[PDB]
Amino acid sequence: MERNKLARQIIDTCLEMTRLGLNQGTAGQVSVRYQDGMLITPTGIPYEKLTESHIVFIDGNGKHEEGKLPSSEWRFHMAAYQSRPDANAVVHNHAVHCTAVSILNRSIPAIHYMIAAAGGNSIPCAPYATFGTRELSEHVALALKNRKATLLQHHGLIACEVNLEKALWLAHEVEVLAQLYLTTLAITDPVPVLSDEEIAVVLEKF
Amino acid sequence: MERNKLARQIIDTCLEMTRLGLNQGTAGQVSVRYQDGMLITPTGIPYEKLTESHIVFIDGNGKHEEGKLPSSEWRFHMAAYQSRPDANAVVHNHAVHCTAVSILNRSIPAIHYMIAAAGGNSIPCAPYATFGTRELSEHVALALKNRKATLLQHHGLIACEVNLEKALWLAHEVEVLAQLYLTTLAITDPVPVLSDEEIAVVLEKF
Amino acid sequence: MERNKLARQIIDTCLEMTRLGLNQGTAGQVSVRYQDGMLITPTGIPYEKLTESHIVFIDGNGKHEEGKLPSSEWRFHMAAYQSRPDANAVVHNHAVHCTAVSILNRSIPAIHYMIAAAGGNSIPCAPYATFGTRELSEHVALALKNRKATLLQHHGLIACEVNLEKALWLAHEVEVLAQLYLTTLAITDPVPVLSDEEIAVVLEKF
Amino acid sequence: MERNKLARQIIDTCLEMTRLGLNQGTAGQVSVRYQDGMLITPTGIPYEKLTESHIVFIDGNGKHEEGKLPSSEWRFHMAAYQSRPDANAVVHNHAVHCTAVSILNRSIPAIHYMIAAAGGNSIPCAPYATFGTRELSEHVALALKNRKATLLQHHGLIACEVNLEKALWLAHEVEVLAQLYLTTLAITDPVPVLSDEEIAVVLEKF
Ligand SMILES: [Zn+2]
Ligand SMILES: [Zn+2]
Ligand SMILES: [Zn+2]
Ligand SMILES: [Zn+2]
Numbered sequence: 001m002e003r004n005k006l007a008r009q010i011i012d013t014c015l016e017m018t019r020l021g022l023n024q025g026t027a028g029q030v031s032v033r034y035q036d037g038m039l040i041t042p043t044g045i046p047y048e049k050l051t052e053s054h055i056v057f058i059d060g061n062g063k064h065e066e067g068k069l070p071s072s073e074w075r076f077h078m079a080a081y082q083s084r085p086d087a088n089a090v091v092h093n094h095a096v097h098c099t100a101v102s103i104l105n106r107s108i109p110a111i112h113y114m115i116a117a118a119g120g121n122s123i124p125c126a127p128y129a130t131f132g133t134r135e136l137s138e139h140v141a142l143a144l145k146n147r148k149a150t151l152l153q154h155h156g157l158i159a160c161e162v163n164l165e166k167a168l169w170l171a172h173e174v175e176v177l178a179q180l181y182l183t184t185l186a187i188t189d190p191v192p193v194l195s196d197e198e199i200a201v202v203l204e205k206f
Numbered sequence: 207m208e209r210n211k212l213a214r215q216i217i218d219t220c221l222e223m224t225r226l227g228l229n230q231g232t233a234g235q236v237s238v239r240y241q242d243g244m245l246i247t248p249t250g251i252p253y254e255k256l257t258e259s260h261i262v263f264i265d266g267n268g269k270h271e272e273g274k275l276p277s278s279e280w281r282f283h284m285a286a287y288q289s290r291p292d293a294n295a296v297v298h299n300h301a302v303h304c305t306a307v308s309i310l311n312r313s314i315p316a317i318h319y320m321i322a323a324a325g326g327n328s329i330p331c332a333p334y335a336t337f338g339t340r341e342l343s344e345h346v347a348l349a350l351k352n353r354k355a356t357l358l359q360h361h362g363l364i365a366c367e368v369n370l371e372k373a374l375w376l377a378h379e380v381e382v383l384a385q386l387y388l389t390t391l392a393i394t395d396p397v398p399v400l401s402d403e404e405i406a407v408v409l410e411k412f
Numbered sequence: 413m414e415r416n417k418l419a420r421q422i423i424d425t426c427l428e429m430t431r432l433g434l435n436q437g438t439a440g441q442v443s444v445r446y447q448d449g450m451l452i453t454p455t456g457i458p459y460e461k462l463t464e465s466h467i468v469f470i471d472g473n474g475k476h477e478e479g480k481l482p483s484s485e486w487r488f489h490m491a492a493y494q495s496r497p498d499a500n501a502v503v504h505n506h507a508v509h510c511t512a513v514s515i516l517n518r519s520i521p522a523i524h525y526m527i528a529a530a531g532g533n534s535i536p537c538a539p540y541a542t543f544g545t546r547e548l549s550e551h552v553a554l555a556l557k558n559r560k561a562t563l564l565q566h567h568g569l570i571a572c573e574v575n576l577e578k579a580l581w582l583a584h585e586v587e588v589l590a591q592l593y594l595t596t597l598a599i600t601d602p603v604p605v606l607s608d609e610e611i612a613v614v615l616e617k618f
Numbered sequence: 619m620e621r622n623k624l625a626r627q628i629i630d631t632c633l634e635m636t637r638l639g640l641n642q643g644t645a646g647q648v649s650v651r652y653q654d655g656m657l658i659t660p661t662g663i664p665y666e667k668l669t670e671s672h673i674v675f676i677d678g679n680g681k682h683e684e685g686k687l688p689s690s691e692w693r694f695h696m697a698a699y700q701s702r703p704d705a706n707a708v709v710h711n712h713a714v715h716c717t718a719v720s721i722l723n724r725s726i727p728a729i730h731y732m733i734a735a736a737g738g739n740s741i742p743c744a745p746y747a748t749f750g751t752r753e754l755s756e757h758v759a760l761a762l763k764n765r766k767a768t769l770l771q772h773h774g775l776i777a778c779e780v781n782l783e784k785a786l787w788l789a790h791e792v793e794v795l796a797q798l799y800l801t802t803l804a805i806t807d808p809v810p811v812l813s814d815e816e817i818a819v820v821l822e823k824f
């Protein structure tokens with residue numbers, strides 16, 4: 001569990017995220033819980049030019065390593081870690097279907113049983129606030145209180161989980177749920193949903 | 207027709223299914239008829255980490271090999287084999303277009319002549335039941351009585367055929383038919399269909 | 413211009429067609445004008461298992477080589493060659509956007525200036541007839557009289573051109589035009605089009 | 619900063635553009651500012667057959683190198699360079715989502731905060747004019763006065779920036795914004811937008 005191994009995993013997750021079609025250009029970031037803060041990708045540097053040494057350490061006070069510039073969206077990664085003690089990895093991206101649902105400012109309701117993967121019967125959509133601000137951080141911390149993923153209005157998605165593999169897995173599943181919702185919403189509104197009783201059974205079963 | 211060769215084919219089918227874009231994360235499973243039961247993929251293990259030895263044997267009584275955990279959705283694979291004696295391979299996935307049609311709880315009608323590939327003039331949609339239950343198994347067995355593929359409401363698709371190659375081929379074709387249906391339904395409802403007389407001619411010709 | 417070189421080009425075109433996402437499963441076929449008839453892909457054989465020796469010669473009388481089974485849809489390839497003397501290669505596929513427009517039974521109108529690539533201000537849609545019949549062949553021959561591509565109602569697309577490279581290029585462009593049409597039709601009907609005067613200028617310029 | 623290095627970058631950008639799904643067939647072109655004019659890709663030659671020596675130099679008077687045929691759409695690349703002195707690279711393509719919005723003749727409004735990447739609160743759509751004409755060039759020069767990207771009605775997109783990497787990055791981002799707009803427009807019209815005050819904050823922050 002050396003820093004370099006965690007750095008490597010972050011980079012591999014970046015590449016896999018792009019592979020899955022969830023990350024376009026320099027939009028996403030991946031972070032992991034580390035010591036008293038986190039390791040996160042830097043600002044600027046395109047993912048394919050990333051090396052272990054580019055990964056940035058930000059302590060619990062929000063001070064980042066010397067000579068490195070963390071992602072411009074680092075603050076809500078720290079908000080996620082402080083809001084959800086169980087979270088050890090965070091994935092943020094601007095995946096198209098998730099982002100399209102965030103533009104409509106809708107939660108994703110229980111249209112499929114895999115919605116329970118994020119912890120309840122919905123995927124919330126936190127209100128808009130300028131990127132990189134403390135206001136945006138507060139909305140994300142409230143949205144993640146009882147869910148492991150949330151949409152961000154006019155912006156994108158944040159997903160957290162116990163490790164990088166699971167966080168990416170969750171982020172992908174939410175993009176699929178988002179695409180199912182938009183595809184069905186174009187045909188019928190509202191879209192048929194499973195009852196809260198049914199989701200309670202699925203939650204227990206998971 | 208050794209176990210190891212069948213195991214290899216299952217794994218290759220998994221990889222090909224992901225390649226075709228039908229399988230996201232750990233959602234799908236592939237099984238084959240074997241001896242008095244079946245060989246199926248295990249629960250948990252991501253497809254790219256799968257080795258021959260991970261494949262699970264489940265006998266006709268539903269008892270699985272020691273120390274292996276079969277897919278959580280194994281029961282409806284067994285239901286398919288008992289309902290359709292001619293089926294030797296089963297593919298299940300949560301492909302997005304198929305799943306979106308299953309959310310609307312619609313059958314796919316005869317919008318294209320390749321609908322006859324699944325045996326009739328439609329692709330049915332079996333009613334919802336919690337994953338992994340005997341109730342869900344009963345709905346699938348009734349739906350596969352006269353069709354080789356069925357949608358599962360709020361869930362996904364199941365396709366069966368005489369070998370793995372054909373089962374995957376069928377599963378892909380049904381996802382295409384599903385995408386054609388949703389794309390046209392967004393424009394016009396109902397969507398123009400071929401008559402039952404015409405599908406009878408195609409069926410004879412196939 | 414040996415047979416084997418033409419066979420190789422056919423196979424490469426098959427692979428490229430699948431690469432471009434125009435060909436799913438065993439749906440498409442590619443043919444070239446040769447001697448007094450044509451060389452076409454066989455029925456059954458999946459594209460990745462195709463070898464030079466699998467390609468089938470069908471003479472001008474419709475008699476095919478001994479021991480080989482031509483595509484089930486060979487007859488409308490012959491109809492294309494007899495209707496358009498200038499055509500030396502034919503591509504048929506069931507590309508999703510083209511096929512979705514064929515289900516609506518609509519021509520694609522002049523929504524983009526590249527529509528002129530197929531010879532006029534539209535992409536026609538020939539009426540449905542059972543696959544492999546002489547009736548279907550007659551509809552295709554009438555549709556290709558003044559266009560190099562046509563949709564086939566409830567079925568797919570046929571594109572022809574002076575060589576394989578250009579035929580595939582045309583088939584791809586028509587699938588893009590089809591996707592533009594369906595994407596815009598979902599928002600507004602009718603879709604804005606360029607005038608016949610404007611298309612006449614583009615045609616001259618090409 | 620030799621000619622050959624710039625030629626190589628152009629070719630790599632072509633390949634990357636096709637990789638990202640923004641360039642179909644021979645539709646796009648890439649140019650760079652060079653000496654008193656520009657280097658641009660040639661007409662005809664498919665991107666995968668392009669070599670350093672195929673790249674064409676066009677001086678400030680519009681005279682192109684001997685024995686080479688520049689892209690048929692070179693004139694609006696020159697218009698971009700003369701309208702925006704800061705632009706050193708230009709990307710043009712007929713990306714499907716951008717082109718679909720250009721068919722509707724709509725600007726893309728501030729549905730996402732990344733709209734500020736092109737310089738303001740919108741992506742304009744310049745009026746139609748026949749490809750390759752001076753009229754089309756004038757519309758593009760007016761549209762790029764205060765934006766780094768513009769749609770071209772019934773045609774496609776043009777994006778410019780300080781280097782090839784950034785120009786392609788911008789072109790990709792605009793295609794994502796276009797897909798978000800069409801996906802949301804199919805559900806609701808008008809689509810929710812951020813206020814001009816909010817975009818002013820984002821612009822300052824960038
Ligand atoms: Zn963001
Ligand atoms: Zn399932
Ligand atoms: Zn066909
Ligand atoms: Zn153009």
